[PDB]
Design a protein around this ligand. Structure first.
Ligand SMILES: *[C@@H](O)[C@@H](NC(=O)/C(=N\OC)c1csc(N)n1)[C@@H]1N=C(C(=O)O)[C@H](C[N+]2(C)CCCC2)CS1
Ligand SMILES: *[C@@H](O)[C@@H](NC(=O)/C(=N\OC)c1csc(N)n1)[C@@H]1N=C(C(=O)O)[C@H](C[N+]2(C)CCCC2)CS1
Lengths: 251, 251
């Protein structure tokens, strides 16, 4: 418990320390990036990057994966009916498929998936995935400012590993997941990712943007965590991109 | 044969006649576009648009569809080994999957698919799809400046129908095909398409760009054919986009 807020495991890869404090501006947090080609990490604010926070809606990545893996949703049909309950966001108040669910961060879609998953499966997956503190707690919205916590550095390690390694997870699962995460594509690059936002007492307190970039030459996994300032998922995306552009990943 | 060079069937939809001769410049051809929402067509140079030409590499769209439909390739694996024969283009001289095959217009990939398809299946599909003159001839590269011919107007009608109508083609087939055709994506739109280029006596003679656009509000099917000037698939793409941008489809 006293070491379950911190990822202490030393890196067995080359790594560089960046200074993107100018881009982060009045916001506080960290940025991590992995380069498939260099098998190397690029970290800004490694202290913050090793502190564990709740994953918020970035966990939807893994919930989506579990749902595909247990045939809750599939490639032929991932649709779910709206229950006719009003939600704060209009995009939630309609039928969803994985793509629309993921793109609009429709909580109830993944909640409905979460309810059909046994706890021992979830716990087995987190173990094998090395997902943060691996702490399910009461097993009720555990990924939402609750027991489960992961570090910015681990977000990149766990995601890259799950996607790139020969897991029990199928290639078509990974591709379907990957489809649901595609944000931008042009001649130069494909950008994939997922935002996370936390709100406490009407104040943003926890902002994620986790994803990856495919170029012609390389492939990159990355994540931005915001802890103070204006720590929203959107602000995490904006910062991620201007860092990726200024580092010449998006050109 | 005397009516097999022309699509004469009258339109049972609204349609408008455009003037994009300025964009076409010193190139000659036509542009067709369909709007799901308006159930209406937008044609420039309807004469040219009704004349049938060989589909070149736009036929790869349908070959890809057939290969998925006959489990020649799958969502799990669509890879094919290179035979270690040199090809004029370097991107051809390696392993391919559907995406790389389609993106680089790797002829041999789809030829290898074509060879495993019965003729009566092909002929059945063209019948049900209303693909052009439906003429297979000797059934050997019939889609390459040979017997099979389709009009710019039909490219849009046949593609839209195959994709949008509940035929025997599965949703996952269509999505996998759709994935292989994605070119550009941003906040505003997803652009999908396939180029075609013909070369005779070292001169471009036949240029295609067939595809569709998904926006927030609408969905559009489109095609550009170039018959004279500099009629290359790439030039057909450039013209398609300038027309789509200037019509405010890519905004
Ligand atoms: C995942 O982060 C989701 N977030 C929430 O449900 C929470 N607050 O959102 C207001 C939350 C969970 S526990 C807690 N204390 N707060 C959804 N995802 C995001 C996201 O960043 O993708 C949302 C924010 N967006 C989508 C709203 C408009 C732009 C960003 C909120 S819902
Ligand atoms: C499909 O159009 C393919 N084209 C060809 O094989 C032919 N010529 O290519 C030079 C061809 C077939 S019959 C005939 N008389 N000529 C491939 N697709 C394209 C394409 O546009 O996707 C290629 C052309 N590009 C990529 C290079 C220059 C313009 C675009 C050629 S191979």
């Amino acid at each position: 418990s006293i070491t379950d807020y911190n990822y202490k495991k030393p890196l067995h890869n080359d790594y560089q320390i960046l200074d993107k404090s100018k881009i982060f501006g009045s916001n506080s947090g960290s940025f991590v990036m992995y380069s498939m080609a260099a098998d190397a990490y690029y970290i800004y604010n490694e202290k913050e990057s090793r502190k564990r926070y709740s994953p918020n809606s970035t966990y939807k990545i893994y919930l989506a994966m579990f749902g595909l893996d247990r045939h809750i949703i599939n490639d032929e049909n991932s649709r779910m009916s709206w229950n006719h309950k009003h939600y704060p966001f209009d995009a939630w108040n309609k039928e969803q498929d994985l793509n629309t669910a993921m793109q609009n961060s429709v909580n109830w879609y993944f909640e409905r998936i979460s309810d059909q998953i046994p706890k021992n499966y979830t716990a087995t997956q987190l173990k094998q995935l090395n997902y943060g503190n691996k702490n399910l707690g009461s097993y009720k919205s555990y990924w939402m400012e609750d027991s489960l916590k992961i570090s910015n550095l681990e977000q990149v390690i766990v995601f890259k590993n799950m996607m790139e390694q020969n897991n029990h997870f199928s290639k078509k699962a990974k591709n379907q997941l990957s489809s649901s995460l595609l944000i931008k594509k042009n001649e130069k690059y494909e950008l994939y990712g997922k935002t996370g936002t936390g709100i406490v007492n009407g104040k943003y307190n926890n902002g994620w943007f986790v994803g990856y970039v495919i170029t012609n030459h390389d492939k990159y996994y990355f994540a931005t965590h915001l802890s103070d300032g204006k720590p929203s998922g959107k602000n995490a995306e904006l910062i991620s991109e201007k860092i990726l552009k200024e580092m010449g990943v998006l050109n």
